[PDB]
DNA sequence: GCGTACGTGCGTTTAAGCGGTGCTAGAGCTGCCTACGACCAATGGAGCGGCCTCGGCACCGGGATCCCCCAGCCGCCGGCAGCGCAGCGCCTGACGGG
């Protein structure tokens, strides 16, 4: 069930299980209204050599 | 489960052990003489107290390793399953015998 990303909006709600990204089984993008503390956002892709291999989580 | 090496036993054999000398070295003691450490009275300054000021170390923050981990990756190889086959014993021909 691959779902197209949708910007979840949480003006006062937390990034709860009601989060559209959460229910969509997908990470919250930086375009989402989930704050800079949302735990569903991607962490940052710090693969030193090249972000290109099996060790690269990305 | 393997296996060796250490316990048990036997058969030499030899140095411990006993009993015996014989010695003098060295310990024990005494006599006597000296010096050296305790004691006493003085003296000052080394040591101990009281301030009291810088920076060595503490602490931080950040960047720098660097081991630790492990899937990636391949080599290897052996097992394994499949395939081709080598050899044999029987099967069965070739041909004279029965």
From Swiss-Prot:
Which post-translational modifications are recorded for this protein?
Phosphorylated by AKT1. Phosphorylation by AKT1 reduces methyltransferase activity.
Subunit note:
Component of the PRC2/EED-EZH2 complex, which includes EED, EZH2, SUZ12, RBBP4 and RBBP7 and possibly AEBP2. The minimum components required for methyltransferase activity of the PRC2/EED-EZH2 complex are EED, EZH2 and SUZ12. The PRC2 complex may also interact with DNMT1, DNMT3A, DNMT3B and PHF1 via the EZH2 subunit and with SIRT1 via the SUZ12 subunit. Interacts with HDAC1 and HDAC2. Binds ATRX via the SET domain. Interacts with PRAME. Interacts with CDYL. Interacts with CLOCK, BMAL1 and CRY1. Interacts with DNMT3L; the interaction is direct.
Say which residues of the entire protein are included here: 516 to 573 of 746
Q: Give the organism's phylogenetic lineage.
A: Eukaryota, Metazoa, Chordata, Craniata, Vertebrata
Tell me what induces its expression.
Expression is induced by E2F1, E2F2 and E2F3. Expression is reduced in cells subject to numerous types of stress including UV-, IR- and bleomycin-induced DNA damage and by activation of p53/TP53.
Location(s) in or outside the cell:
Nucleus
**Associated disorder, per UniProt?**
Weaver syndrome: A syndrome of accelerated growth and osseous maturation, unusual craniofacial appearance, hoarse and low-pitched cry, and hypertonia with camptodactyly. Distinguishing features of Weaver syndrome include broad forehead and face, ocular hypertelorism, prominent wide philtrum, micrognathia, deep horizontal chin groove, and deep-set nails. In addition, carpal bone development is advanced over the rest of the hand.
Q: Which organism is it from?
A: Homo sapiens
Q: What is this protein called?
A: Histone-lysine N-methyltransferase EZH2
- Belongs to which family? Belongs to the class V-like SAM-binding methyltransferase superfamily. Histone-lysine methyltransferase family. EZ subfamily.
What does the UniProt function comment say about this protein?
Polycomb group (PcG) protein. Catalytic subunit of the PRC2/EED-EZH2 complex, which methylates 'Lys-9' (H3K9me) and 'Lys-27' (H3K27me) of histone H3, leading to transcriptional repression of the affected target gene. Able to mono-, di- and trimethylate 'Lys-27' of histone H3 to form H3K27me1, H3K27me2 and H3K27me3, respectively. Displays a preference for substrates with less methylation, loses activity when progressively more methyl groups are incorporated into H3K27, H3K27me0 > H3K27me1 > H3K27me2.
Tissue specificity is: In the ovary, expressed in primordial follicles and oocytes and also in external follicle cells (at protein level). Expressed in many tissues. Overexpressed in numerous tumor types including carcinomas of the breast, colon, larynx, lymphoma and testis.
